[PDB]
Design an enzyme around this catalytic site. Structure first.
Site, PDB file in Angstrom:
ATOM      1  N   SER A   1      10.252  33.568  42.497  1.00  0.00           N
ATOM      2  CA  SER A   1       9.919  33.997  43.488  1.00  0.00           C
ATOM      3  C   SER A   1      10.941  35.100  44.531  1.00  0.00           C
ATOM      4  CB  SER A   1      10.233  32.201  44.574  1.00  0.00           C
ATOM      5  OG  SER A   1       9.642  32.538  45.645  1.00  0.00           O
TER       6      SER A   1
ATOM      7  N   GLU B   1      -0.134  28.164  43.901  1.00  0.00           N
ATOM      8  CA  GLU B   1       1.269  28.782  44.244  1.00  0.00           C
ATOM      9  C   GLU B   1       1.565  28.659  45.816  1.00  0.00           C
ATOM     10  OE1 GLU B   1       3.259  30.920  43.463  1.00  0.00           O
ATOM     11  OE2 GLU B   1       3.130  31.361  41.711  1.00  0.00           O
TER      12      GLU B   1
ATOM     13  N   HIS C   1       4.457  26.235  43.066  1.00  0.00           N
ATOM     14  CA  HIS C   1       5.352  27.078  43.170  1.00  0.00           C
ATOM     15  C   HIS C   1       7.057  25.866  42.817  1.00  0.00           C
ATOM     16  CE1 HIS C   1       6.687  31.247  44.491  1.00  0.00           C
ATOM     17  NE2 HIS C   1       8.156  30.158  45.243  1.00  0.00           N
TER      18      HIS C   1
HETATM   19  P1  LIG Z   1      10.808  32.220  46.949  1.00  0.00           P
HETATM   20  C1  LIG Z   1       9.677  31.960  48.195  1.00  0.00           C
HETATM   21  O1  LIG Z   1      11.582  32.578  46.581  1.00  0.00           O
HETATM   22  N1  LIG Z   1      10.372  30.184  45.944  1.00  0.00           N
HETATM   23  C2  LIG Z   1      11.676  29.473  46.775  1.00  0.00           C
HETATM   24  C3  LIG Z   1      10.321  29.127  47.951  1.00  0.00           C
HETATM   25  N2  LIG Z   1      11.518  28.295  45.836  1.00  0.00           N
HETATM   26  C4  LIG Z   1      12.432  27.233  46.207  1.00  0.00           C
HETATM   27  C5  LIG Z   1      12.080  25.749  46.628  1.00  0.00           C
HETATM   28  C6  LIG Z   1      11.573  28.164  44.909  1.00  0.00           C
HETATM   29  C7  LIG Z   1      13.280  28.316  43.889  1.00  0.00           C
END
Ligand SMILES: *[P@](C)(=O)/N=C(\C)N(CC)CC
Ligand SMILES: *[C@@H]1O[C@H](CO[C@@H]2O[C@@H](C)[C@@H](O)[C@@H](O)[C@@H]2O)[C@@H](O[C@@H]2O[C@H](CO)[C@@H](O)[C@H](O)[C@H]2NC(C)=O)[C@H](O)[C@H]1NC(C)=O
Ligand SMILES: *[C@@H]1O[C@H](CO[C@@H]2O[C@@H](C)[C@@H](O)[C@@H](O)[C@@H]2O)[C@@H](O[C@@H]2O[C@H](CO)[C@@H](O)[C@H](O)[C@H]2NC(C)=O)[C@H](O)[C@H]1NC(C)=O
Ligand SMILES: *[C@@H]1O[C@H](CO[C@@H]2O[C@@H](C)[C@@H](O)[C@@H](O)[C@@H]2O)[C@@H](O[C@@H]2O[C@H](CO)[C@@H](O)[C@H](O)[C@H]2NC(C)=O)[C@H](O)[C@H]1NC(C)=O
Ligand SMILES: *[C@@H]1O[C@H](CO)[C@@H](O)[C@H](O)[C@H]1NC(C)=O
Ligand SMILES: *[P@](C)(=O)/N=C(\C)N(CC)CC
Lengths: 534, 529
Positions: B199, B325, B438
């Protein structure tokens, strides 16, 4: 002396017809009935004047002249193109109609089918062999009427606001013929209260324009629109672009000695030989294209008080029954008329660059952004350069943009606003088709089956094709009689905006399907207009 | 125990021996790599940690960088697993090293993990990032660092020396420099460093790929469910200045950059956190307030432009996505969505959700999204509308940015391997309609199923061992393949990727090619014209 069946009195005087042999029995035919004064000389570009009455007997015994028009020379001697070319002499003296009626004449009022030929508003004739009304009349015991109407500059050159060339006179020719049917069809045994218009391509667009024009709407009951709609991108033109095209045509033939006084301009145009106008007709188009025609109906507030799109959306269509449909491969025929890399004589396996260039030819006069949107939707991004897929995709672009999606929009909006709609896709490739296999079921090649042409013994259709034609004639006549193609057997359900049901017309029984290329037509009908405005 | 004693450039460290089902590993947790960015150092680039006397106790995780704490579903496993599991502090610039036991005496390939969290959250101490299983099973050195998030890491008054922006990325770079200088003391090979992240961590990896001062600090890269070219991972200078200015106003600070930052530095850290979400220009999902800024320094251009103009010969990358995702993000604001029901939304909710999932675009752009993601034969089917909006959010924010990065890198000289992760964990606490959400491949990459105290199946343990082998194979050689069927490289033409599931590898074509042509090729032209 005389056959009383072949003698009829109409409002203008007496007529004499002929007895026609058909494979199923005799039919009475009155061919070449004058319904307007000849639009010659000072009457060129003017609305049609009703035919003045005559003494004695007019012989309505053969097709009259084809309205003056361009003659296709792309493939000389080739049957696939020659079948659409004039089969009578060209003349501006061409405002005649034809009536077929059963022999003996019907004793009770009989439903009437009125045919309006297509031809891009620049060509066509009621005399073409494929529009022969004798088989329908014999097989289904209806009265059939067809008329000639002026095409090209003679029918649709418009200097809007002018008295000398107001435009849409070709549509007024059709309306006058429809008024003639109302006043005179009963003399042939026809029921003026049960008149069903049907037409194909520009003829279908004409039918739709009569639907959306109140003075015409009172002259018929039902409508059939084959492979055409009034809301297509090719079927109408704005006032300014119509004036630009008319002015450029005048300039190309030396009038005036550009623009100026309309009366002077038209007077100069009236001195030019008809063939001189025809020879410069295609040059007034703003760019190279396919499925675009120079002189078409003009939206000027008179015949059409608004665009067909607006009139369709704003219309109350309760009490109306319509039958609409398309062929399986609407776009393929038009590609050999300008799209790079296309020919009837090879497989037309185009490259990616030819596809991209073809998009600008098949979708002319749109922004680069609009063209990119078309390329997005019609590219398989897992096979972006496959020549066979590119060929079919460009055929889809032209067919969807010009025929399928205008028809789908008309069908859905009419159904949602009160009309009973029946929709079809014609999927049988004729055994006698002379076009290459890659064209599939091309535009215009359902007509011969609707008219029962396979029943002609001199032709070599298969036996099952004759059965197929009889089935289609039955659907069409059933609709004309009752507003429902179904037999009073698999059922043909109405088309609705939600379920979007249509049937496939082929040698096999009816098959019900959903959606007239719904995903693609959502692009053409719902999104692309929003893009063009912003 | 001499194995747990290490001298780095700054001084001496004492680690801890950890148990795994496969044997022990050595862990050095909470190694300081920067001076604490406190007080006058808030918003400033990190400074290297000054040398220390004595022995630093490196036996436990250090504090979590100050960040918002999720409260959508209090006590719920699916959200709590991402929340801070140590005390919050601005004194948080520490990193962790896992090595085999006894420590390797020959140079060992190094994996460096950068956590995600939308650039507003995350910590190297989360259970799901426990490096002990990867290190034991595949005999690598694993390094993970904490970096500043939220306003503390990415508040930017562009042009100012007091708040230049991107200091959270500079925290990561400083840790990467620390690895170059010190990892050999643990048995790691500084010439064989593979960055991997998920992410915002994957977006970070990509940004180090596109910033020349970072490029010399690692060899290969893995980008899981993230890319630097997303619509959420960067912000322009003008919008960053507006967000920093609005934050100051929301906390009682004046609008001159020096006076503005000075006032911000007087506020307690929690106060900045409490107003972070309100500087966003509209209600949305998958948008975050303080993210990397494109100001010509760390990124000389937009990631999109740098990717298109780059020569990527000599680079190997591993990229991929999960099956669904978008689903996780829908419960954070799309109307009608909840983890506690089937989220069968209406057409009106779908259309409203499109403006939430695709914020700050013209009405025409939103109509184009509705056109492509509507089944016009079933325009109002609630189950289809739910899946479609999940696709909108997932494609726009993750899949298509990853697909664009993969295709452009491959066409410009890089060797790319692409996957789609399709196994839903037997332990997943999110509802079934979310599918494979995700972030839920991470636990398998880190071999968490091998922890016997957890409830993963025997199949899932073998699966995790397969995935650890692919990832370590790639770190060692630039090729995930064992000597299967084979995992072919991704190319702009063939667009081949593999499905990662309990079944053997399956090769497929196209990362949502038709949908991503819309987002990557057409929609930019529409927005600009
Ligand atoms: P990316 C948008 O940094 N993924 C995040 C939103 N997740 C946390 C719930 C994965 C760590
Ligand atoms: C535009 O011209 C027409 C026609 O004018 C005639 O033809 C010209 C070529 C020239 O020979 C003129 O002298 C002719 O009069 C105008 O219509 C004419 O208007 C006059 C005045 O009423 C009238 O005597 C003519 O009979 C009319 N002719 C016709 C056929 O209608 C018209 O008024 C002019 N309009 C303009 C210039 O705006
Ligand atoms: C398929 O045919 C088109 C049309 O070309 C015409 O028809 C052919 C059967 C052949 O007889 C040609 O000589 C004719 O001109 C081909 O496209 C043409 O290519 C020529 C030269 O390559 C060019 O001068 C024309 O402008 C082209 N015409 C159009 C409409 O694009 C096409 O290359 C053929 N495909 C093949 C051979 O694979
Ligand atoms: C599915 O749930 C959403 C979310 O509502 C919350 O979660 C539910 C599990 C339940 O506990 C509700 O009481 C909660 O409010 C529902 O969307 C909400 O609907 C209400 C009206 O009933 C509305 O006032 C809220 O604004 C909605 N919230 C959002 C975020 O849209 C949704 O209706 C549920 N779907 C069903 C029951 O089919
Ligand atoms: C049908 O075939 C016969 C026999 O060869 C031929 O004479 C006739 O011309 C064909 N019909 C048509 C319409 O071509
Ligand atoms: P429409 C555009 O009038 N289709 C015509 C041109 N066809 C000619 C082959 C069928 C009459």
């Amino acid at each position: 002396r005389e056959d009383a069946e072949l003698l009829v009195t109409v409002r203008g005087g007496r007529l004499r017809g002929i007895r026609l042999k058909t494979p199923g029995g005799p039919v009475s035919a009155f061919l070449g009935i004058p319904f307007a004064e000849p639009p010659m000389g000072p009457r060129r570009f003017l609305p049609p004047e009703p035919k003045q009455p005559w003494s004695g007997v007019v012989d309505a015994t053969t097709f009259q002249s084809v309205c003056y028009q361009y003659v296709d020379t792309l493939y000389p001697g080739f049957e696939g193109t020659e079948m659409w070319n004039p089969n009578r002499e060209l003349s501006e003296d061409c405002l005649y109609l034809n009536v077929w009626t059963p022999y003996p004449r019907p004793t009770s009022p009989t439903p009437v089918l009125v045919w309006i030929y297509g031809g891009g508003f620049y060509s066509g004739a009621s005399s073409l062999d494929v529009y022969d009304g004798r088989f329908l009349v014999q097989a289904e015991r209806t009265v059939l009427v067809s008329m000639n109407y002026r095409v090209g500059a003679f029918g649709f050159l418009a200097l809007p606001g002018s008295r000398e060339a107001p435009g849409n006179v070709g549509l007024l020719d059709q309306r006058l013929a429809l008024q003639w049917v109302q006043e005179n069809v009963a003399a042939f045994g026809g029921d003026p209260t049960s008149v069903t218009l049907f037409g194909e391509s520009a003829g279908a667009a004409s039918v739709g324009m009569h639907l959306l024009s109140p003075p015409s709407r009172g002259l018929f009951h039902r409508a059939v629109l084959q492979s055409g709609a009034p809301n297509g991108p090719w079927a109408t033109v704005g006032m300014g672009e119509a004036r630009r095209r008319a002015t450029q045509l005048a300039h190309l033939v030396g009038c005036p000695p550009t623009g100026g006084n309309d009366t002077e301009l038209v007077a100069c145009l009236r001195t030019r030989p008809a063939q001189v106008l025809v020879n410069h007709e295609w040059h007034v188009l703003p760019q190279e294209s396919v499925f675009r025609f120079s002189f078409v109906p003009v939206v000027d507030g008179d015949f059409l008080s608004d665009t067909p799109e607006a009139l369709i959306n704003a219309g109350d269509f309760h009490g109306l029954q319509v039958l609409v449909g398309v062929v399986k491969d609407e776009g393929s025929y038009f590609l050999v008329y300008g799209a790079p890399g296309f020919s009837k004589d090879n497989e037309s396996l185009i490259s990616r660059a030819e596809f991209l260039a073809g998009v600008r030819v098949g979708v002319p006069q749109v922004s680069d952004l609009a063209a990119e949107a078309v390329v997005l939707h019609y590219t398989d991004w897992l096979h972006p350069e496959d020549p066979a897929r590119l060929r079919e995709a460009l055929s889809d672009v032209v067919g969807d943009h010009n025929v399928v999606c205008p028809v789908a929009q008309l069908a859905g909006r009419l159904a949602a606003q009160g009309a009973r709609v029946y929709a079809y896709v014609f999927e049988h490739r004729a055994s006698t088709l002379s076009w290459p296999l890659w064209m599939g079921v091309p535009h215009g090649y359902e007509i011969e089956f609707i008219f029962g042409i396979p029943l002609d013994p001199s032709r070599n259709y298969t036996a099952e094709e004759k059965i197929f034609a009889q089935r289609l004639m039955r659907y069409w006549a059933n609709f004309a009689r009752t507003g429902d193609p179904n037999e009073p057997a698999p059922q043909w359900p109405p088309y609705t905006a939600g379920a979007q049901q249509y049937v496939s017309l082929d040698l096999r029984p009816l098959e019900v399907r959903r959606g007239l290329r719904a995903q693609a037509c959502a692009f053409w009908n719902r999104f692309l207009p929003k893009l063009l405005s912003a």
